[PDB]
């Protein structure tokens, strides 16, 4: 019986908490700062005695906000109204969708809540990174009253942001907006077994007490108790004959 092992073989998801790496999954560099979405910083209206008939006069209950914090990137030629072309062949080579000359694509508002950068995944949709619902927007602050030609070309679109292996602490606020709950760098966990598969097979469980036994006289000759620590023995008897510090 020294030559008799139970040959397992099967399936098994480790659950949802098997974190086979250390801390952060994705991005590990770039700080706990963010990507480049839609700036919407504004308190908003209130619910108090204001707009009445003749009771009390109300001033102005409006303060729209749709700015967008970001950062330019790539370089291209001119930046007209027809997007922009980072090249030139037989005509104006309109930049690709996944990337259009100067600056770059940006997270839109539709994105369920905004998070920081060091916490950001969005599954792909073309063998070369690209999604859908892409919208552009040109920029030009220096309005001297002469040239209205922009210089940037943002490609705002929604992504599939989430965070399966990232959890933060205290978000900017509680309200579900474009703030930054940004959960990040979860705690690592390696799911496996125990040296010499301790547990695995029920030992010392009268109920599930094994059963070798002959046929000719079929009397089971194996009957465990609940005092015959089995695991602990073998694991004890192993360091002994050889450093349990082995890696078979």
């Amino acid at each position: 019986m020294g030559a008799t092992y139970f040959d397992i073989k099967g399936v098994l998801d480790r659950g949802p908490s098997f974190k086979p790496y250390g801390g952060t999954a994705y991005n590990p560099l770039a700080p706990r700062e963010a990507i480049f979405n839609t700036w919407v910083e504004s308190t908003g209206p209130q619910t108090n005695v204001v707009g009445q008939m003749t009771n009390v006069y109300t001033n102005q209950t409006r303060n729209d906000k749709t700015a967008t914090l970001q950062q330019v990137n790539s370089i291209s030629g001119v930046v007209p109204n027809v997007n922009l072309g980072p090249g030139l062949s037989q005509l104006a080579s309109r930049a690709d969708v996944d990337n259009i000359g100067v600056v770059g694509r940006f997270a839109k508002v539709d994105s369920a809540g905004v998070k920081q950068a060091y916490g950001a995944y969005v599954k792909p949709v073309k063998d070369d990174g690209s999604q859908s619902l892409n919208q552009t927007a040109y920029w030009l602050m220096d309005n001297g009253g002469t040239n209205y030609l922009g210089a940037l070309a943002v490609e705002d679109y929604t992504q599939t942001l989430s965070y399966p292996d990232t959890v933060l602490v205290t978000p900017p606020t509680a309200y579900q907006q474009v703030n930054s709950g940004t959960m990040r760098a979860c705690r690592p966990n390696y799911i496996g077994f125990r040296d010499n598969f301790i547990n695995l097979l029920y030992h010392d469980s009268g109920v599930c007490s094994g059963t070798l036994n002959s046929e000719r006289s079929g009397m089971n000759v194996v009957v465990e108790l609940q005092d015959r620590n089995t695991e602990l023995s073998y694991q004890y008897m192993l360091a002994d004959m050889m450093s349990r510090h082995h890696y078979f």
């Binding site: 092992y5 998801d13 480790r14 086979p20 547990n199 094994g210 089995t230 023995s233």
Partner: protein, 298 residues
Amino acid sequence: DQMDNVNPFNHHRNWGLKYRSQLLGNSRYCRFHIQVPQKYFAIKNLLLLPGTYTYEWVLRKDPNMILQSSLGNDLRADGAQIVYTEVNLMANFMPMDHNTSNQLELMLRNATNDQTFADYLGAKNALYNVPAGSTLLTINIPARTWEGMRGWSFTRLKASETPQLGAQYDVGFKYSGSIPYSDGTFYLSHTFRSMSVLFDTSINWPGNDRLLTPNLFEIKRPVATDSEGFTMSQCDMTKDWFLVQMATNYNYVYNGYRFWPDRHYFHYDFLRNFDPMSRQGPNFLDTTLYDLVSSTPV
């Protein structure tokens, strides 16, 4: 200090668990296959002779048994799942010549030479759940015959970090960490104080003014230094107790106090795993002597 008492092993840098947690995969999901043996004290070395012998054993599923975790949390709360595709019983025989064969049985089938198998641990298992504040732990054994008795090997162990063996499962265990009661990852053992042994309530073992305190082997002297006298080793151990784990151990003691070559010191050892600490006043003493002392939280 605020850590002495937790299962270290159940750490993340347990290089072993960091290891065994891969011959599977970095994806919570593994279309596995493996070869698990048995270890039942009474067969591992059995060599059965000609003519079939019925056989039946059983696998378990509780994810807080057949599965370990660095952080150590039941994988049921997050239903981890195992499913045995199929299993068999491989077996490698010995192409033993036949006359020769016909011989060993001819012999192996003898009365004189009936094999036998004795278990390494060599002992019984009793479980006395202590309270959760209690300090002494009285274990009045009953009457009976103690013939053959070796002695007492003993260590404390959490409650939650140890299960009560019996039926298929136990709808209460919610832990994926370690079972020193099944790996000896003992770490809750030097938390012991005294250990009185009473035969027949009138006679004590060993008694015969053996220990500088024989009414109970001592294991340590109260926090505030009091038994600096019978301390020793430069640790709380009593010049009494050091001489036990140093007696029933390396037979070195009555005439030499050296580290019996580790060649007799692998794992469950007393010397190497033996660690002696020391530290001063982390508030530079309470509010008494040190003229301008204080406490400061977070």
